[PDB]
Paper text:
[name] is composed of N-terminal Zn-finger, RRM, palm, fingers and KA-1 domains. The C-terminal region of [name] is a previously unidentified RNA-binding domain, and it was named the KA-1 domain. Thus, the present structural and biochemical studies have demonstrated that [name] acts as a U6 [name]-specific terminal uridylyltransferase.
Therefore, the amino-terminal putative zinc finger (ZF) and RNA recognition motif (RRM) (amino-acid residues 1–140), the predicted disordered proline-rich region (PRR: amino-acid residues 235–304) and the carboxy-terminal region (amino-acid residues 651–750) neighbouring the nuclear localization signal (NLS) were removed. The truncated [name] ([name]_ΔN) was overexpressed in Escherichia coli, purified and crystallized. The form-I and -II crystals belong to the space groups P21212, and P21, respectively. The data sets were also collected from the apo form-I crystal, and the structure was refined to an R factor of 25.3% (Rfree of 29.7%), using reflections up to 2.8 Å resolution. The [name]_ΔN structure consists of three domains—catalytic palm (residues 172–403) and fingers (residues 141–171 and 404–598) domains, and an additional distinct domain linked to the C-terminus of the protein (residues 599–874). A comparison between the form-I and -III [name]_ΔN structures highlights the mobility of the KA-1 domain. The KA-1 domain rotates by ∼40° with respect to the catalytic core domains, using α14 as the axis of rotation.
Residue numbers in the entry: 145 to 223, 329 to 637, 763 to 815, 826 to 877
Write the structure that this text describes.
C-alpha cells in the first residue's frame, strides 16, 4: 500500500488498466468478506436472542461493490412527533445497551440519536471491525442494491468510482462534515455516466419503468422498484474507454453550474433550481452550493452538507485534473521509472495546490462593485501590481503579508505622540491600511493569480512565481485580510 500500489499502477499497460488494477487492489478479499460475514452472524445471533424473528441486513460499503480495505460495516436491524422521536431514540438506546453489554467482543458503543438517521456506532475488537447499527434505514439497503446493480449494468462503473474516490480522498474533497460523502461522490459519478451523449448508465426512472412483477417495493412513501438483475436490461452503446470517461468527468463537473442545478439521477437530468421549483415539488429538499438528488428519496440532497468552499475546491480540483488529463503524461505511459497516468492524480496534494484549490469566501456584493473593490484592495492597500468569471494577475516585490503588526504599532505610537498622516474619517479603511503597507518598506518576489466566480462570489488565489515558497503565508493572510477589507468597503455606502 502506497508503495506496492505505486509500482503496481506504474507497471501495467494503460490508464484504464491502472483503474482496473486499482479496483482489484482496493477491493475486499474473500477473507475480509468471510470475517465480516462471521461478525454479522454473531450480531444476528445476539439480536435474535433479544428480538425473535429479526433480520440483520448489511448495507452500505459492504454490499454495494464499492468496498475498500478497512471500510465500515453498516448493519440495518429489521424487527405524536416528539413522542415518535423519543420512542425511536429509546429503542436506539435499547439496541445500544444490547450491543454494549451482551454480544461478545464488541466495545466502543456510542449512541447517536442526534444524526439525521439515528445510529448506534459500534466496534468489534477481535475482528478489528467498526461500523454503524441503524434501527430504521430501509432506503440505504435499496440504494446500496442500486449501486451494485449500477456496477453490474456497465463494467466501467467500478473503475470510475474507485479511481475517482481515491482521487477525491487525495484532493481532500471527501469525508465527513463539510466534505462529500462516498455515497454523494458515487451518485455524482453515476449522474455523470447518465448524462453522456450515449448514456453509459440508464436513468433511475427508466429502471423503475422497467421494474418487474413482484419487484415493486415502497419505502417511506418512495418508489424503490428496480430490476434485480442486469440481464433483463440492454447494455450501453457508449464506446468511450475508461481514461476518456475520466477526463470527461473532470472537465464536465468542472464546467457545470452547481448552485443553479439540482442533479437528478432519477430523470438523469439537470433540474433548474432557480427559482423554487424542486423545493416546491418535494418540499423536503435542502438547497446549497452542490445539489445532488438521491435516486429514491427525492426530498433528500446527499450533498446538502457541502459548504461553498468544498464545492469550489471540487470544481477547481476537477478543472486542474482536466488540465492534467490533456497532457501527454496522462495518456501515454512512461519509459522507465517516471510517474504517469493515474499516479499524479492519486498522489497527495501540494500545500500550495491544496490552498489554491479551496477558494476564499467573500462578503455579499454586486459582481462589478466586488471586483472593483478587490482590485482596489490589491492595488491601493497592498503593494500589488495588478493587470487584467473574472481574473487578474498580481505581482508582489515585498513581504507585505507579514510585519504589519510592528508597523501598525509604530504608526500608532507616532500618531499618539504627535501629528500623523491620514484623511479624516469616521472609520475609513483603504488609504490607512495602504499607509501601513507602504511603511513596511526588479524581479517579482511572489506573483499569483486572483479569480472570482459569478456564483457564488468567491476568490481563488493561485501561485505563479514563488521562488522562496512563501505563498501559503500570503494565502492565509489573504483569507483573513480580504473579507474584512470588502467588509469595511461595504460600509462606505
Ligand atoms: Cl457536460
Amino acid at each position: 500500500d502506497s508503495h506496492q500500489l505505486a509500482k503496481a499502477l506504474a507497471e501495467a499497460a494503460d490508464v484504464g488498466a491502472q483503474m482496473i488494477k486499482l479496483v482489484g487492489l482496493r477491493e475486499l478479499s474473500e477473507a475480509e468478506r468471510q470475517l465480516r460475514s462471521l461478525v454479522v452472524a454473531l450480531m444476528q445471533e445476539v439480536f435474535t436472542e433479544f428480538f425473535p424473528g429479526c433480520v440483520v441486513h448489511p448495507f452500505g460499503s459492504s454490499i454495494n461493490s464499492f468496498d475498500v480495505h478497512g471500510c465500515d460495516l453498516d448493519l440495518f436491524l429489521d424487527l405524536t412527533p416528539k413522542e415518535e422521536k423519543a420512542e425511536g431514540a429509546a429503542m436506539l438506546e435499547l439496541v445500544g445497551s444490547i450491543l454494549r453489554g451482551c454480544v461478545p467482543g464488541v466495545y466502543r458503543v456510542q449512541t447517536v440519536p442526534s444524526a439525521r438517521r439515528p445510529v448506534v456506532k459500534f466496534a468489534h475488537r477481535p475482528s478489528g471491525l467498526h461500523g454503524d447499527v441503524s434501527l430504521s434505514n430501509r432506503l440505504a439497503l435499496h440504494n446500496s442494491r442500486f449501486l451494485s446493480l449500477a456496477s453490474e449494468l456497465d463494467g466501467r462503473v467500478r473503475p470510475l468510482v474507485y479511481t475517482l474516490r481515491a482521487w477525491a480522498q487525495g484532493r481532500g474533497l471527501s469525508g465527513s462534515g463539510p466534505l462529500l460523502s462516498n455515497y454523494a461522490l458515487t451518485l455524482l459519478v453515476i449522474y455523470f455516466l447518465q448524462t453522456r451523449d450515449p448514456p453509459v448508465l440508464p436513468t433511475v426512472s427508466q429502471l423503475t419503468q422497467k421494474a418487474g412483477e413482484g419487484e415493486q417495493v415502497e419505502v417511506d412513501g418512495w418508489d424503490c422498484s428496480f430490476p434485480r438483475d442486469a440481464s433483463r436490461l440492454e447494455p450501453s452503446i457508449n464506446v468511450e474507454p475508461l481514461s476518456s470517461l475520466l477526463a470527461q468527468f473532470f472537465s464536465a463537473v468542472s464546467s457545470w453550474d452547481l448552485r443553479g442545478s439540482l442533479l437528478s439521477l432519477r430523470e438523469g437530468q439537470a433540474l433548474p433550481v432557480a427559482g423554487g421549483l424542486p423545493s416546491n415539488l418535494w418540499e423536503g429538499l435542502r438547497l446549497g452550493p452542490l445539489n445532488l438528488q438521491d435516486p429514491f428519496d427525492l426530498s433528500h440532497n446527499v450533498a446538502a452538507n457541502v459548504t461553498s468552499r468544498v464545492a469550489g475546491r471540487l470544481q477547481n480540483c476537477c478543472r486542474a485534473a482536466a488540465n492534467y488529463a490533456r497532457s501527454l503524461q496522462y495518456q501515454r505511459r512512461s519509459s522507465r521509472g517516471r510517474d504517469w497516468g493515474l499516479l499524479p492524480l492519486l498522489q497527495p496534494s501540494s500545500p500550495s495546490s491544496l490552498l489554491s484549490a479551496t477558494p476564499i469566501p467573500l462578503p455579499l456584493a454586486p459582481f462589478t462593485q466586488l471586483t472593483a473593490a478587490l482590485v482596489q484592495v490589491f492595488r491601493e492597500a497592498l503593494g500589488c501590481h495588478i493587470e487584467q468569471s473574472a481574473s487578474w494577475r498580481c505581482a508582489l516585490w515585498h513581504r507585505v503579508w507579514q510585519g504589519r503588526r510592528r508597523a501598525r504599532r509604530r504608526l500608532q505610537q507616532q500618531t499618539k505622540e504627535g501629528a500623523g498622516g491620514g484623511a479624516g474619517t469616521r472609520a475609513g479603511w483603504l488609504a490607512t491600511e495602504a499607509q501601513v503597507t507602504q511603511e513596511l518598506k526588479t524581479e517579482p518576489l511572489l506573483s499569483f493569480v486572483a479569480s472570482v466566480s459569478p456564483a457564488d462570489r468567491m476568490l481563488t488565489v493561485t501561485p505563479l512565481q514563488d521562488p522562496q515558497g512563501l505563498f501559503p503565508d500570503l494565502h492565509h493572510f489573504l483569507q483573513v485580510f480580504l473579507p474584512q477589507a470588502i467588509r469595511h468597503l461595504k460600509l462606505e455606502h
